[PDB]
Amino acid sequence: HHWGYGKHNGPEHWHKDFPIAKGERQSPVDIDTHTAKYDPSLKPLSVSYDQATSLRILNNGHAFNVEFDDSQDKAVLKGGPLDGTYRLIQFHFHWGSLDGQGSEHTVDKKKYAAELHLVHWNTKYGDFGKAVQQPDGLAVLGIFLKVGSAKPGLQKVVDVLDSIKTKGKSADFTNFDPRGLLPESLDYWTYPGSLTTPPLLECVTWIVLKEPISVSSEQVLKFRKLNFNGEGEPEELMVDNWRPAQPLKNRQIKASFK
Numbered sequence: 403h404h405w406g407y408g409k410h411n412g413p414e415h416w417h418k419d420f421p422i423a424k425g426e427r428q429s430p431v432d433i434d435t436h437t438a439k440y441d442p443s444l445k446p447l448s449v450s451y452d453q454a455t456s457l458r459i460l461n462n463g464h465a466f467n468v469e470f471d472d473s474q475d476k477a478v479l480k481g482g483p484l485d486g487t488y489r490l491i492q493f494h495f496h497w498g499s500l501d502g503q504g505s506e507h508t509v510d511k512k513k514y515a516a517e518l519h520l521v522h523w524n525t526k527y528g529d530f531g532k533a534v535q536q537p538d539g540l541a542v543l544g545i546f547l548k549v550g551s552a553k554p555g556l557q558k559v560v561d562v563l564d565s566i567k568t569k570g571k572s573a574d575f576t577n578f579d580p581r582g583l584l585p586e587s588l589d590y591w592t593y594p595g596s597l598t599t600p601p602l603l604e605c606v607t608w609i610v611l612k613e614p615i616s617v618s619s620e621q622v623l624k625f626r627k628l629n630f631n632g633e634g635e636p637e638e639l640m641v642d643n644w645r646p647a648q649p650l651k652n653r654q655i656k657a658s659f660k
């Protein structure tokens with residue numbers, strides 16, 4: 403009886419195994435755009451993905467992860483609200499059963515169809531497992547997805563999904579360029595928060611981009627053909643793999659833009 407997204411094991415149950423679910427800096431949150439304060443001390447974000455080396459794509463039973471070689475400083479995030487250098491380890495998505503839900507963060511209570519998370523760890527802690535034990539250990543870049551025009555840079559991901567339909571399947575996934583998943587603008591909101599899945603550790607500086615990317619209905623429909631179950635098990639479509647907004651508590655969301 404492991405955690406997942408269903409009504410007997412989903413987000414309202416997670417606190418029993420992970421009591422930090424009811425902590426002081428949980429994610430995601432609703433971004434109230436009129437209350438977020440412009441902070442002129444915030445720096446532009448530096449996203450350096452020119453040397454990113456993807457290796458593999460994995461269906462972990464919750465989502466799919468596109469994994470990178472993080473054994474050297476290649477793909478790094480810096481600037482913005484961050485002190486120091488954060489190395490890209492993986493990306494994944496959260497999405498819905500229908501286009502009206504799927505994102506984890508919300509904007510003035512608006513839910514997007516999906517949300518991309520690019521996960522990076524702070525190199526000053528040496529490895530990812532040490533980073534997640536620190537309040538400034540991770541930086542996750544969050545990008546909203548809306549349904550309209552296709553995202554050409556997403557199509558390589560979409561086309562490999564048939565080969566990782568079920569939990570525990572992986573596939574080689576080299577030379578994928580995550581620059582093709584970024585919007586034009588790097589304007590962002592930022593706040594201190596947590597992982598949005600168990601173990602829910604309070605280790606993340608969230609950077610949520612204001613500009614969504616557009617993906618096609620066909621692209622998101624292929625996300626929704628994945629399975630939460632393993633091969634040879636009854637089919638449970640991989641949809642609605644998002645945690646709802648959590649209480650903001652004693653936090654301020656800052657905006658990089660006027």
Ligand SMILES: [N]S(=O)(=O)[C][C][C]C1234B567B89%10B%11%12%13B85%14B%1158B%12%11%15B%139%12B%1061B%12%112C5%153B%14874
Binds near residue numbers: 542597
């Ligand atoms: N939504 S999120 O906060 O970016 C957490 C994504 C899930 C996981 B998978 B395992 B390790 B791998 B890394 B940390 B652990 B789970 B948390 C992030 B990724």
Ligand SMILES: [Zn+2]
Binds near residue numbers: 494495496519598
């Ligand atoms: Zn995530």
